[PDB]
Structure formats: structure tokens, C-alpha cells
A paper describes a structure:
Here we dissected the structural basis for neuropeptide-gated activity of a neuropeptide-gated DEG/ENaC, FMRFamide-gated sodium channel 1 (FaNaC1) from the annelid worm Malacoceros fuliginosus, using cryo-electron microscopy. We solved high-resolution structures of FaNaC1 alone, with full agonist FMRFa, with partial agonist ASSFVRIa, and with both FMRFa and pore-blocker diminazene, identifying the ligand-binding site and elucidating the conformational changes induced by ligand binding. Each subunit comprises a minimal N terminus and a nonresolved 63-amino acid C terminus facing the intracellular side, two transmembrane segments (TM1 and TM2), and a large extracellular domain. The FaNaC1 structures presented here capture a ligand-free resting state, two ligand-bound desensitized states and a ligand-bound dilated channel state.
Preparations of FaNaC1 alone and with FMRFa (30 μM) yielded 3D reconstructions with a global resolution of 2.7 and 2.5 Å, respectively. The FMRFa-binding pocket is formed by α-helical segments α1–α3a (residues V87 to F144), the β6–β7 loop of the same subunit (residues D234 to G241), and partly by α6 from the adjacent subunit (G423–K428). The FMRFa N-terminal phenylalanine residue (F1) is positioned near the entrance to the pocket and the M2 side chain orients downward between α2-F129, β6–β7 loop-I236 and M238, and α6-F431. Additionally, FMRFa M2 main chain carbonyl oxygens are 2.5–3.1 Å from the FaNaC1 α2-Q133 amide side chain, indicative of a potential polar interaction. In both ligand-bound structures, however, the channel pore appears closed, with radii of ~1 Å at the level of G503 and G506 in TM2a (G3′ and G6′ in a TM2 numbering scheme). Thus, FMRFa- and ASSFVRIa-bound channels have probably adopted a desensitized state in the prolonged presence of agonist, in accord with the large decrease in current amplitude that occurs within ~2 s of FMRFa application, especially at higher FMRFa concentrations (for example).
Author numbering:
A (entry chain E), B (entry chain F), C (entry chain D): 609 to 612
D (entry chain B), E (entry chain A), F (entry chain C): 2 to 205, 209 to 529
The structure:
Amino acid sequence: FMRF
Amino acid sequence: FMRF
Amino acid sequence: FMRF
Amino acid sequence: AIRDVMTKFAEQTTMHGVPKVINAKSSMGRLFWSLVCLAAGAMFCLQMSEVLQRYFSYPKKVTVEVVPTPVPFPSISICNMRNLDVHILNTLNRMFIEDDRPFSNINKSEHEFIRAYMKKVAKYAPLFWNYQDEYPEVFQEIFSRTTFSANIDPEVIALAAVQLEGFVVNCHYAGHRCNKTRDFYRFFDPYYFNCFTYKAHEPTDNLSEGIENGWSSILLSGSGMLDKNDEIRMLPGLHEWRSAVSASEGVRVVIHPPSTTPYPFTEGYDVPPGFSASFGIHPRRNIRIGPPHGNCSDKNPFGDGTERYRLMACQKMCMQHYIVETCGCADVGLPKLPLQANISWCRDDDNFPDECMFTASEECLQLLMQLHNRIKCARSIKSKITKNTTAMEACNCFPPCDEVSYDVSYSLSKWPSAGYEGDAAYFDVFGIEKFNERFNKTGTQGKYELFTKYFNVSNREESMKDFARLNVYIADSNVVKTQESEDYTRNQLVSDIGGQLGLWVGISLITLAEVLELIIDLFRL
Amino acid sequence: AIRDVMTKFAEQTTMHGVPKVINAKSSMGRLFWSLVCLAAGAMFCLQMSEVLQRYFSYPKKVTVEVVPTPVPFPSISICNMRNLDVHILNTLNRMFIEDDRPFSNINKSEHEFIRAYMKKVAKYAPLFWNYQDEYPEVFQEIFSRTTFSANIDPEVIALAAVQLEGFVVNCHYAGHRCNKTRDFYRFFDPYYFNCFTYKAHEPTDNLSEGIENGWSSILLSGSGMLDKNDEIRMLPGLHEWRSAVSASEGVRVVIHPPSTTPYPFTEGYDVPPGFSASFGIHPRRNIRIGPPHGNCSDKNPFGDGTERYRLMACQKMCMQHYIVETCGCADVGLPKLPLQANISWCRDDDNFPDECMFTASEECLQLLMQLHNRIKCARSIKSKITKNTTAMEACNCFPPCDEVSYDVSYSLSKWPSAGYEGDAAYFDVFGIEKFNERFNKTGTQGKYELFTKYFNVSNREESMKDFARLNVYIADSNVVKTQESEDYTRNQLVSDIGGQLGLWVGISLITLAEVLELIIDLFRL
Amino acid sequence: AIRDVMTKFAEQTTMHGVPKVINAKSSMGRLFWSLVCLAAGAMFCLQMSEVLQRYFSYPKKVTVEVVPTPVPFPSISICNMRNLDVHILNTLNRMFIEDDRPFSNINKSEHEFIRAYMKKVAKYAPLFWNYQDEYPEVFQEIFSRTTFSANIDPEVIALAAVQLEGFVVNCHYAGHRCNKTRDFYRFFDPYYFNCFTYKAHEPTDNLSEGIENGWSSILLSGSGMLDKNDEIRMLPGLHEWRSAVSASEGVRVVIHPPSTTPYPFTEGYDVPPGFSASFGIHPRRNIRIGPPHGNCSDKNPFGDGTERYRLMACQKMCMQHYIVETCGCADVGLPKLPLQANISWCRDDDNFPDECMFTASEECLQLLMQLHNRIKCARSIKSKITKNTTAMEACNCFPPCDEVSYDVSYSLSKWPSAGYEGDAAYFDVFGIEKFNERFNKTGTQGKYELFTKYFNVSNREESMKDFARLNVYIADSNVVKTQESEDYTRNQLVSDIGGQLGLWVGISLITLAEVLELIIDLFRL
Ligand SMILES: *[C@@H]1O[C@H](CO)[C@@H](O[C@@H]2O[C@H](CO)[C@@H](O)[C@H](O)[C@H]2NC(C)=O)[C@H](O)[C@H]1NC(C)=O
Ligand SMILES: *[C@@H]1O[C@H](CO)[C@@H](O[C@@H]2O[C@H](CO)[C@@H](O)[C@H](O)[C@H]2NC(C)=O)[C@H](O)[C@H]1NC(C)=O
Ligand SMILES: *[C@@H]1O[C@H](CO)[C@@H](O[C@@H]2O[C@H](CO)[C@@H](O)[C@H](O)[C@H]2NC(C)=O)[C@H](O)[C@H]1NC(C)=O
Ligand SMILES: *[C@@H]1O[C@H](CO)[C@@H](O[C@@H]2O[C@H](CO)[C@@H](O)[C@H](O)[C@H]2NC(C)=O)[C@H](O)[C@H]1NC(C)=O
Ligand SMILES: *[C@@H]1O[C@H](CO)[C@@H](O[C@@H]2O[C@H](CO)[C@@H](O)[C@H](O)[C@H]2NC(C)=O)[C@H](O)[C@H]1NC(C)=O
Ligand SMILES: *[C@@H]1O[C@H](CO)[C@@H](O[C@@H]2O[C@H](CO)[C@@H](O)[C@H](O)[C@H]2NC(C)=O)[C@H](O)[C@H]1NC(C)=O
Ligand SMILES: *[C@@H]1O[C@H](CO)[C@@H](O)[C@H](O)[C@H]1NC(C)=O
Ligand SMILES: *[C@@H]1O[C@H](CO)[C@@H](O)[C@H](O)[C@H]1NC(C)=O
Ligand SMILES: *[C@@H]1O[C@H](CO)[C@@H](O)[C@H](O)[C@H]1NC(C)=O
Ligand SMILES: *[C@@H]1O[C@H](CO)[C@@H](O)[C@H](O)[C@H]1NC(C)=O
Ligand SMILES: *[C@@H]1O[C@H](CO)[C@@H](O)[C@H](O)[C@H]1NC(C)=O
Ligand SMILES: *[C@@H]1O[C@H](CO)[C@@H](O)[C@H](O)[C@H]1NC(C)=O
Ligand SMILES: *[C@@H]1O[C@H](CO)[C@@H](O)[C@H](O)[C@H]1NC(C)=O
Ligand SMILES: *[C@@H]1O[C@H](CO)[C@@H](O)[C@H](O)[C@H]1NC(C)=O
Ligand SMILES: *[C@@H]1O[C@H](CO)[C@@H](O)[C@H](O)[C@H]1NC(C)=O
């Protein structure tokens, strides 16, 4: 999961 | 002050 | 002296 | 009296064969002389066939020579490969590190670009959180630089893009210091954002320093002041996913004729940070001829005529024409046609509802896919159209009739040398020029602190690698001129016709007047 | 009746001087007119001498112009400057670290290349242990890459050389992703071992991404994953002792016409790891004329005719011809002649007995020196023969009659930028493309572990420096065409002869028929 | 008898119109034939006007072709961008670290250059201590390299500048090792100090090694052995303040014709340390024609004639001429005119009294400002004069009549590869060639200790970055020849005149003899  |  |  | 009038002609005529045919006593002699005349005529006709074929092919004659007439110094356009300012980038990164929800960050800053950026990103946040593992490529395409360029006012982007005072440390041309606010002209590029064109200024200045035979400048181009995240985070608007220039560090340098628009995305040279680049210019001049002998144009068919003509502009606007015709939208990577301006960009996303800021609904996903499809249409047309000779020839793009071009020698050296000379360079940048103190202002103090920490004396050997120097000079003063000219003029045609006509039959036009007089006499027979 | 027949001629003739000479009343007039005729004739003869000298010199006329007809996209050949795979190299190093006797390592591995390599090295181990201080240069010459290339089956070397799936991370051409197994063609080079030629594929694909106006690829070219030994150890087959390309890191890039064999050892451009290289192609086309006006050939005198002709191939095979003639053996650095193939390489060492694997006898040392002498013979011929104009002209190597050539702009940028864009690039390589998972296979697991350790997220700023990006595009769509043509045609010769003959004497061929008729009349006198 | 003599002419003449005008029976016929004759004459006159305009414009004809005749291998001149030797620089730095007063350091060393350097600096020490905050730019200008070059004997500077044995590690040309003391020729440049020109040596040598098709050399060019000061200190004579090449690390490489003087400050290519540079030469030859058709010269108007002519030298000496005329002094950056040599350099400072070594008096400050003003005068003339077409054309600088030129492909690779091949390269430099042991001499022991510490086996991965390799080779064996020739010869003029005269009026010179005979008969009327 990639966050901003 | 700059030295040699 | 150089080794392989 | 046909025989009598022909005999009178044969008594007073300059033709070589007719008197011998008419006054022939032996029938064998008459046959022989008729054959001689026919052979001469046929040979003349064949030679004239070849001569007129050569003439009506309209050949060209080309000379290549070096001339002493000097060209003006070319326009130099410099683009930082990083689109946004370092302090703005760090502020964005830190803001996402404190709150990863872009919606809550809309009102966290007074900077206009930051508010617009947060509002634009917030329209995609639920979709990115719910579908990044199903459609990674779509989100990489949509968070590219060009979408922010297409959807945010360039006058707002310019407040956050690279600034001239923070980009050009020093500039010298023709033995005197440059006046940055006078000699650099800012223009906006959809990928590089802020770019600057240098226009040469000759000595009138009392600031006698620098290179005498060209242009030299020191540019801050590195990215080493940016925060190093412990895990990979999405920062939209920075990376042009899988573009050939994407994620690169350095300066894009374009050498082009003075009053011309540069196209840094497809022309120019690259320079890495920490290096000194030497550009040795060899000027060229090409002169061309018009429709019967070739094709050349003095103006762009698609333009308003303010620019000095280059074929590249015509071809790019032809591509834009076909893209607009097929996809119904314009590409940001090409100029918008001066005909119509109500044409929307293909990457426009003002259609997105504000509910997409709160929910990852199917309508929002379908709109995302539709934007992706528009981008794909534009890319497909861009890739295919230039191979299509019919479409390209329909645009009537021809090379300029009087073109100045440059051949550039390219070489690199590690600019800030280790040791004492590097100390001298650092003192020149930060002690004499006082680069940091440009930012000691109420509106730029954060950047001042950042540069004060990064560029301290102890860390100079590493920090100076973020600078690059450009050295642009004319290598050969003489211009290599390639000039077209018509190879076979009408005078040359007349002379060759005279040679052939004298060799074979011996007719002159005064003798054609003999035959005309005989024709009128036969009318009076 | 000689005077009477000449008078009859003078009464009816078109010659300008003869009637005045014949009908001259004053002797002074006859002398004057004879002198006039002689002067006219002599001047005509001199002018014809110059004219015919110009014609029989067979001059050429050359035009340089830009044309809209497009060239096909060139073939791009990429060679990794490292010849062997990183995992194979580490395995060899570790195997020698556990047992420095190559003989005992012959049966330690199931890899074919490793067994062949160990067997080849074992023939030299006692000599290297007993004489490395007396003949260091001999052992450096013999443990070079080219000896392993000459003495190990290339189909066995290909199992250990750089693989396409481990070399090309991404590829894009004309707006769509490349199909690596379809578009890349592997060929073997005696110095670079595995090399790959890209052949362009136009849109038909649904993978709409990448550069639209050219070719771009990301290549793993660095050597930073290799073990760092605490002391220097001999690893044969890696270093081409004192070659101009020896011990270098990066990619060798060759831009050449589509159906042509590349020669990376003497043509192409260099690219360092950690940089993005831009190649701006300006296409050229040269058209030439045959034997009387020049020299050009459409085929290679030494070849089978399957290749598209380039002068470089002809010159290289001429060099190989002379090397084979003098030394009695062929050089691996040049093509083997399609005539004979029973010719042995100069670096062949199958003569070495198996007792040399156990003893450093004088016979083994003499064989070592004989191999060294063969290498020296080949090198001496290579160095001398190209200065010998007689030998080079005897091979009848002429430039192609219709040649396509490319002028390439070259520039570099530091590709993986520090900070956020570098994070995006890393995620593109390892998150989206999933480069490491190519090696998650039973036959390549060790390399998978190596890359998993080396390319972890924390070490990205250093590890990404092992990649390099190539950006190859056509800078100017129009082709600069240089065309030879014959300057002085036979028609131009005829026209100039007519001009001269009309100016001086006024003869036409119909008047030469006058003189012929007079000659026949004198035969009937 | 005017009518009778004209009738006799009309009875026996070859002119086409005059007999018809004279023997005309109808007055209308006479008018018609007079009009025909006048029209033919006028058309002939117009065509001759165009023909003679073309001839007296003296056009040129240019052919571009590839020829097999080979050029000799070019002269290669290499300059280290660092002017002084590393041990000398470290000695100077340490001497100032122990005593910052240059006056007390005059007698601290037996090296001649050090004593001269200390004496020169001591003349400025009180001024620098008292005014560095008021006039930093003046002291940066005066402590530049070029002032020491202008004011210290070059035979003394050569003892401290970079030495050949400490600069060139290895050299190979045409398959054999170079003989450094035989093939390299040292020359002095006011900015680079010591520079070396390589002159090719063909095989006669028994040292069969290296590149066969060109020239390759390994050069020590980095500055990483120099001490890293904890604060910035003034070291005069090292930094050319705000020059376009100032504070750079690498090698300056100039490829020029054999017997020519190189000008590294304005021509050549850059190479950074730690990289391998490939130079692919494409030779060119230009042949030109003299005054009526063009301008070309075989000798330099300002020179003694020992050099092979290049236009660059003529232009530089023209610039020096105008600088000497205006400022009354010569620039060290340009050749001194072989006419006069009593001309002083603009940067000369022998006027400075010895009291300036003790006091910062107003006289010393005024002398400092006067030297600054002289430098500014020279720089202003250098910047302005080349734009002044009158002054540049007054020097009669024309391109050579037979010129050999080179187009060079440029590319870089990271030379010392990480890992095993880097180990092999290190062993080649330090184990086989034994680079350090060159300095194991009584006069160079300190440098031996420095290199022994810096280049130890453990630190090889970092220390090898100070080396750079040059690979210079001829890419295409055939020479691209551009030859001027006269387009419209006198013979072509005569032939075209004959064609025109035959076409319109039908006159031959034998008929002009008719009219001359008639004129003499009228004199005898
Ligand atoms: C750079 O150039 C600008 C003009 O292009 C200079 O600004 C001018 O300064 C003069 C006084 O010297 C004023 O009379 C003008 O009104 C100014 N013009 C503008 C547009 O501001 C500026 O001083 C120059 N800067 C330097 C450092 O020389
Ligand atoms: C100038 O450009 C025109 C393009 O309109 C050329 O005309 C074309 O020539 C090609 C052959 O080269 C034909 O296949 C096309 O049908 C032509 N198009 C038209 C509209 O006629 C023309 O030949 C060019 N002239 C020169 C001298 O190069
Ligand atoms: C890359 O191209 C190859 C062909 O060059 C593709 O393999 C073919 O796949 C089709 C089905 O799509 C089969 O019918 C053919 O028999 C295959 N040919 C070969 C030689 O294997 C391959 O699918 C392509 N790969 C990608 C990722 O598109
Ligand atoms: C084409 O190549 C031939 C090479 O065989 C040239 O002939 C040679 O010309 C040189 C002078 O340039 C003479 O020294 C040789 O003796 C010639 N060799 C032979 C076998 O005749 C020929 O001149 C070339 N033609 C053109 C038009 O360039
Ligand atoms: C490099 O060349 C020089 C000459 O240019 C060589 O020195 C000569 O050596 C021979 C004996 O071999 C003497 O007879 C000459 O008097 C020497 N000449 C000079 C000027 O010293 C030198 O030996 C060569 N070096 C190498 C390593 O080959
Ligand atoms: C050769 O160079 C001379 C320079 O002296 C040229 O003469 C000059 O031509 C320019 C026009 O191009 C005139 O403005 C100058 O007045 C001329 N100078 C003199 C002293 O006459 C000459 O034209 C050149 N010749 C060629 C064939 O290029
Ligand atoms: C070339 O362009 C024309 C006009 O846009 C189009 O009609 C034609 O189909 C194109 N050619 C191909 C092969 O698609
Ligand atoms: C920065 O500005 C402040 C006043 O706002 C001043 O006190 C300080 O000395 C300045 N610093 C520099 C380095 O100019
Ligand atoms: C200089 O800056 C570096 C980082 O840029 C920092 O690590 C170091 O402590 C600083 N040194 C001083 C003396 O401020
Ligand atoms: C040039 O080559 C020919 C044929 O190989 C040979 O006979 C001749 O000796 C060579 N020239 C020289 C100077 O060795
Ligand atoms: C590698 O393959 C194994 C099965 O052989 C699998 O369990 C594992 O998840 C794979 N890892 C990756 C990163 O694909
Ligand atoms: C990442 O790899 C480096 C070496 O490649 C290693 O030193 C480091 O410990 C690794 N970090 C993690 C978190 O695995
Ligand atoms: C050009 O040079 C001449 C001679 O040096 C000089 O007289 C003239 O003033 C110069 N031109 C200008 C514009 O100063
Ligand atoms: C250096 O020279 C000394 C004698 O002056 C010698 O003892 C020593 O072995 C030499 N060292 C090397 C590495 O050649
Ligand atoms: C090698 O040299 C480096 C500095 O050049 C030094 O730090 C290191 O201790 C040295 N190692 C040995 C084994 O001498």
C-alpha cells in the first residue's frame, strides 16, 4: 500500500 | 577575514 | 604472489 | 512557278542542305543530300530532346563554402529538469508526512499553487486508495507533470516552479556580467514548467569580468537538498511516468536562432549536475530556391508570423492538427493552434465531480478510464502520424529559404575540483556573489534556512555537486554557407541550342526568316 | 580539272574561308585568307584540346539538399561492457576463494561454462604459479577475454554471458512497449560476448506507453553487485589487458542501418552507468556513380551477399585476409572469411598437453611463448596493414553506391535523480515492472537473492546508479541527401563542340558533307 | 563606288542578313530585313550581357566526395586542468598553514618556483589583509593563474607544473608502447602551464601491446590527493577567477593537424577524471581557390612561417595586434607578435616597490588599481574587436588553401569498473607498470610517500577515480574531401559565345574577317  |  |  | 520560286530561294539562301537538294543535277545526288538533311535533323531532334529534358527537370546547383560574414550570437534556453522549487517540494512532502489525506491539506497553506495542487489531487485520493493495486499504470499516468500543467493556471504554477534568482547563480557574456532581469526571458513548458531564454547583450557597463568569446553561467541543478523518505511515497506532479526524459537530474540546454521558439522536449542537449559542459558552436547558413527548383518557405502556414520560421514548428503544428482532428482534443506536448483556442486539452479533468473527493464510486472510476483513453488516443496519433507521408505532405511544411543552423561540440569536465580550487569556487559562489542572501526575505526565509544548512563550509565537497556550469562559445568565426542555385538557366539553354543548331544543321534565326519569307512568297504564288 | 572542280566547289559551298582562298584575285589576298583560315583552325584545335581534356577527365557534380522522404528507424545494438553475468562472476570468485587450484574446481559445478572455464584455466595454473614474476605480461595477455572466446564454444559462453531478461529492464518504441523476445536479436562478439540488436516494430498493441518519437530503454549496466576482494586475485577471461576498451563500465551503443552487421569494437558510442544518454539522429543519404566517374560497389567482395553493404566490413575482411596470409591464422577481433573456415584462430590453445595441468615443464613454457608469438604476429599485421595503400587498394573496397548514414548528437544527464523522482523511478523498476521477480526461478534463484539484497528500498540511492537509460530519437525528420552526378555529359560535349565550331570556322556536318562530296568528286577526277 | 563595293561584298559574303538588306528589291523587304537584323543583334547583346555577367562574377564549383587517400594521424595535445603538481600544492598549503605571512616563507624552501611564488605574493600581502573586504574582486583578479604566468619565468614554472612522468601513466599507438621522452613534446600555456603534444611514431619495437587502430593513454587527472582544509584559505596562482574553464577537474584534449600550434583555451574537448573518453575521428580535407574566385592563403600574415597555417592563429594575432595598439600591452591569453617582443604583458607587476611588502600605502593601492585597469582594457578590447568587421577584414585572415580538419565523436564510460576488472586495472597500473616507483628518487620522495598512502590497495575503489583514459582513433578510413573549382572557365565562355553567335546572327570570326576586308576596301575606295 502506497501513501501520498 | 581570509588568510593565505 | 598473486592467487586465482 | 513553285519550281521557279524554290530555285530563286536556292540561289539566295543560307541553309546548308536545301540549295544542294534543290539544285541537284543527279538523282543519286538528290537522294544523298535528302538523306544527309534527314540525318542531321534527326540527330538535332534527339539532342534537343535530351537538352529540353535537362532544362525542364529544373536542376539545382549547390556550393559549400566558408564565409567571413558573422552570425549573431544564438539564443540559449535553459530548463531545469526539476519542474518545481526545492522548498515547495519539501513543503509538499512534509505536509503529506503529517496528513496523507490531500483533502485535509487544502486549507493548510496560503500558497496558491499548494491549494490548487491539493484540490486537484483530492479528486483522485479515494480512487488511488481503493484501486492502486488493480490499475497502477493508470494512476502513474494521471499523476504526471503534464496533467497539472494542463489543469492548473500557468500563472499559478510559475509561483512554485523554478525561479530565475534561484536557478542562475552567475552569468557572463562578452566580457561583462549579465543583467538577469534584463537578459533572461521566462517561458512556460508543459513538462519543464519554468524555462528561461537568454538574449545576448553587447557591450555598451563597468562590470568587466567573465568569458570574452562566448557565454558562461553557473546553474543550481541538483536535487540533493530534498528530503530522503524512509519509504516510497506518492508525490503527484513530479514524475512523467515512462517518458524518455522522466526522473532525470541536470539542465536541458537549447541553442537556437535568436527570434525562435525553442522546443526543449525534442531538441537540445543534456548537462548533469556537478559537471562543466563546453558547447563549441560551428554556425551554418543554408540558402534555398523556390517552387520550380525546390521547395522552401519564409513563413509558417499554421502560425501568426511573429516567429522566425523553423520547419520543426510547422511539423509540430501539423501533428497537433491531426491530433485535434482525430481525438477531438489537443496535446499539451505540442503548441495549440493559433486558429482555435476553445479546443480542450486531452488531459483536462474539470469534468470530475466533487463527490469523487469523498467516494470511490463507479462513475469516478469510469471518468478515470475515459481520461486514460483520451491520453491513449493522443499518444497513438502522435506515434503514427509522422510515418504517414500523405498527411505530412498535406501540411505543406518546407524548409526555410534562409536558415541559420549550429553544429555543437559537446564535452564534460567535473566542475568543482576537489581541494583548493573547489574552495575558491565555493567562496566565489557564497562569499563574493552571496548566493544564499538572495533568499533572506520575508517570503523566502524557509529556503534561506534550507540553503544555509545544506551549503555550509564543512559540507562543500558534497553540496557543490548540485551546481553545473555551461560554457557556450563560437568555435569557428567563419560561417559554413550552403547555397542553392539554379544549375541550368534559360541563357545556358539558349547557348546550348545555338551550339547544337550550328553543329548539325547550321540554321540561324535570320535563316528561319529566310524560310518565313519563302512561306509568304508561296502565299503570294 | 583540279582547278576547275575546286572552282565549282567554291561556287557552291558553305565554308567561310575556302571560297575566299580559291577565288582570291590578289596573291596578297590569298596569303591573308590562308593565314585567317590557319589561325581559326589552330584556335579551334586548342579549344577542342581543353574541351576533350575536360570531358575525358570525367568530372562529377555533387548536390547537397534536404529531402522529405523518410528513412526507416535505424538498428540499435547494445552491448554490456561486462562480458559475464554477475552471479556467474561471483560464483567464480567465491570458488577460487575456497580453492585457488583450478584443477580441483573442474567437478565442483554443473554449469557447462564453469566446467569449460576451469578446464581451460587449469592448463595454465602451474605456469602462472611458477613464472608470474618473470613473465607477467604473457599471463595478462593469455588470460584475456578473447582467448576464452576463441577456445570455448560460443553456445556454451552464451549460457554465462549477459542475458536479455537480466539486461533490458524496459523498452519503448513509437508509443508502445517492446516485446523483448520478438524485437531483440542476440549475436556474439569475441570481446563483449553477448550483444543484442533491436529491430523496430511499428504499431499494429494496447500497451500505449513510452516515447512516441523514438526508442528508449533502461539497462542494468553497473558492476556494484560484485564482491569486493580484500586482496587482488586473478580472474581469467574478464580483463582484455591494455585494450583501449578494457576494464570499463557502461553500455556500448551502435546506431547502424537496419540490415547491417555492427562492429562494436570500432564503432558506436559509450554510456556510463547512472546516466541518461540522449542520441539525436540526423539521417544522411549518399548516392554515388560508377567506374568512369568514381568508384562505388553494391556488394562486398569478400561476403556471401546476405548483408547490406558497408565499407567497414570490406576493409575488416581485407585485414583478415592479409593476417591469414602472413601469420597463417585468423584474428578473433575480425570476421572469419566466408571462403575458408578450417583456418584456426591465432589464440587457439588446444595444442596444450594435459600434463601442463600438473607440471610447469619447459615444453609447456615454450608452447606458452609460441602462443604469445602468434598473438604478436597478428597484432603487428593489424597495426601495419592499414597504412599500406597498395594492399588496401588491392582489396577493391569501395564506398556503397547508395549509403544511409547517421550523425548523432550526444549528451548525458544523471538519470536517477536524488529524492522523490528517484523514488518514483525505483518504484517503476521494482514495484510496477517487478524486475527482481524475473529471477524467481529454480535455475536463477541465487541471482534473485543477490538482487533482493542489493536493490532493497533503503539502499536505492546507491544501487540505482547501476542502471543507465538510452534515449534514441530522430532529431530532424528530413534527410540530408548528397548525390553524385556526371558533370559533363556527352550532350554537353556536343553542344560545346558546336559552339566552338560555329564561332571559329563555321562548319556544320552538312558542310563536312560538302568536303566529302568534293573528295568523292576528286576520286572521279 | 560605295554602292558597287557593297554589292560586291553582298555577292561574296557569309553574313546572313547583310546580303538580303543590300540586294533587297522592295523597300518593304529592306525594312523587314533591317528589322530582322536589329532584332537578332539586340537579342544577342542581351544574351551576351547575361553571359559576361556570369563570367565576371567568377563563380565557384564545389564537390563533396569520399576518397581513399589516407591522412596522417593527428597531433594530440593533452593539458591537465590543474596547473601545478600535487606535492607542490600541498607544500604551499602546509607552508601557509604554519606561517600565513608570505614574506617569512621566502627563505623556507630551496625550490626555485616556491621562492619566486612567495616573493610575488609578498608584494600583495598587506593590501590583501587591509582591503580584502573593500575590493574582493580586485584581489581575485590579481591572484589568478595568468599573473604568475606573466610574471614568473616559464622555465621556473615548468619545475613546479605537471610533469610528463607524473601525468601519463601508459601510452599506446599502432600496437606498440609509446616512448614518452621521444614522442611527447612539452609546451607552455599561460593558463594550463605545462602541456604536452603527442606526435605519432609508426612501427619500425618488440613492445607489441595496446590499441592497433589508434591512440590510447591513461592519465592521472584528479585532485583527490590534495589536503582538505577545514576553512577556506587564499592560495594565489591556482584559480582563474570567473573564467569559463576556472576551477575544473579533468583533461583538455586537442586534436589538430600534425605541425600546428594548439590553442587549448578556445579549442579541444573536456574529459572528467574517472571516465574513459572515446574520440572517433572523421578526417576532412578542404581545397580552395585564389583571389578572383575566392580568398585563401598558404601562410600566416603575422607569423614567421614555421607553422602549418590555420586561420585561428591569424585571427588570434589580429586580436593581439589591436590589443597592443589600444592598451599599449599584450595579453598572455594570445600569442605575442613575432614582430616586436619588447611589448610588456598587461598583467606585469614589476613596477611594484618592495615597500609594498611591508606597508599598505596609498601608492601601492593605486598601483593595484592601475594593474586592474590595464586588465580591464585588455578584456574590453578582446570582447569587442571580433564583432568589428572592419578591423577583422583589415587583417587579411583567410582560410587555408589546403586544410585538413577532423570531426570527432565524443562519448564517455566510467573507466575503473567496480569489482574484479577494477582490480585488474589497479594491478596493471601499480603492479605491472609500477607507477609509484617513478617517484622513488631523492628529488621526489615526498610525492612517493603521498602516492603510496593515497593509492594503497584498500582505497583503490575511490583512488582510481583520479585517473582518466583517452581512446583516440580514426572512425572512417576514407577522407571526406571538399574541393573548390572554377565553375565557368574561359573555354566554357568561348563555347557559349559561339553558341549564341551561331544561333542569332550566324557570324564566325572568318566572317568578321569579311567585314574587316570590307573596311580596308573602303579605306581604299
Ligand atoms: C538591469 O537592467 C535594468 C533595465 O533593464 C535596470 O533598471 C533600470 O535602472 C535605471 C537606472 O539605472 C532606471 O532609470 C530604469 O527605469 C530601470 N528600468 C527598469 C525596467 O527597472 C537595472 O538597474 C539593471 N540592474 C543592474 C544590476 O545593472
Ligand atoms: C515540392 O513539394 C511538392 C509537394 O506538394 C512536390 O510535389 C509532389 O511530388 C511527389 C513526388 O516527389 C508526388 O508524389 C506528389 O504527388 C507531388 N504532390 C503534388 C501536390 O504535386 C514537388 O515535387 C516538390 N518540388 C521539388 C522541386 O522538389
Ligand atoms: C511477444 O511476441 C511473441 C511472438 O513473436 C508472442 O508469442 C506468440 O503468441 C501468440 C498468441 O498471442 C501465439 O499464437 C504464437 O504462437 C506465439 N509465438 C511465439 C513465437 O511464441 C508473445 O505472446 C508476445 N509477448 C507479449 C508479452 O506480447
Ligand atoms: C577507382 O579506383 C581505382 C583503383 O583500382 C583507381 O585506379 C588507381 O588510381 C591510382 C591513382 O589515383 C593509380 O595510382 C592506380 O595505379 C590505379 N589503379 C589501377 C588498377 O588502375 C581509379 O583511379 C579510381 N577511379 C576514380 C574515378 O576515382
Ligand atoms: C626512447 O627513445 C630514446 C631516443 O629517442 C632512446 O634513447 C636512445 O637510446 C639509444 C640506445 O638504445 C642511444 O644510442 C641513444 O643515444 C639514445 N638517445 C637519447 C636521445 O637518449 C631510449 O632508449 C628509448 N627508451 C625506451 C624505453 O625505449
Ligand atoms: C576576398 O576578400 C576581400 C577582402 O579584402 C573581399 O573584398 C571586400 O568585399 C566586401 C564585400 O564582400 C567589400 O565590402 C569590401 O570593400 C571589399 N574589400 C576590398 C579591400 O576590396 C573580396 O570580395 C573577397 N573575394 C571573394 C571572391 O570572396
Ligand atoms: C494517413 O493520413 C490520412 C489523413 O489523416 C488518413 O486518411 C490515412 O488513413 C492515413 N494512413 C493510414 C495508413 O492510416
Ligand atoms: C538577513 O536579514 C536579517 C534582517 O531581516 C539580518 O539581520 C541578517 O544579518 C541577514 N543575514 C544575511 C546573511 O544577510
Ligand atoms: C554542515 O551541514 C551538514 C549537512 O548539510 C551537517 O551534517 C553538518 O553538521 C554541518 N556542519 C556545521 C559545522 O554546521
Ligand atoms: C604492402 O603490402 C604488400 C602485400 O601484402 C607487401 O608486399 C608490401 O611489402 C607491403 N609494404 C611494405 C612497406 O611492407
Ligand atoms: C517467488 O516464488 C515462490 C515460489 O517458488 C513464491 O512463494 C514467492 O512468493 C515468490 N516471490 C516473489 C517476490 O514473487
Ligand atoms: C539493504 O541492503 C544493504 C546492502 O545492499 C544493507 O546494508 C542493508 O542492511 C539493507 N537494509 C535492509 C533494511 O534490509
Ligand atoms: C572598428 O575598428 C576600427 C579600427 O580599430 C576603429 O577605428 C573603429 O572605431 C571600430 N569600430 C567601432 C564601432 O568602434
Ligand atoms: C625505493 O628505493 C629504495 C632505495 O633508495 C629501496 O630500498 C626501496 O626498495 C625502493 N622501493 C621501491 C618500491 O622500489
Ligand atoms: C589506505 O589509505 C587510506 C587513505 O588513503 C587509509 O585511510 C587506510 O588506512 C589505508 N589502509 C592501509 C591498510 O594502509
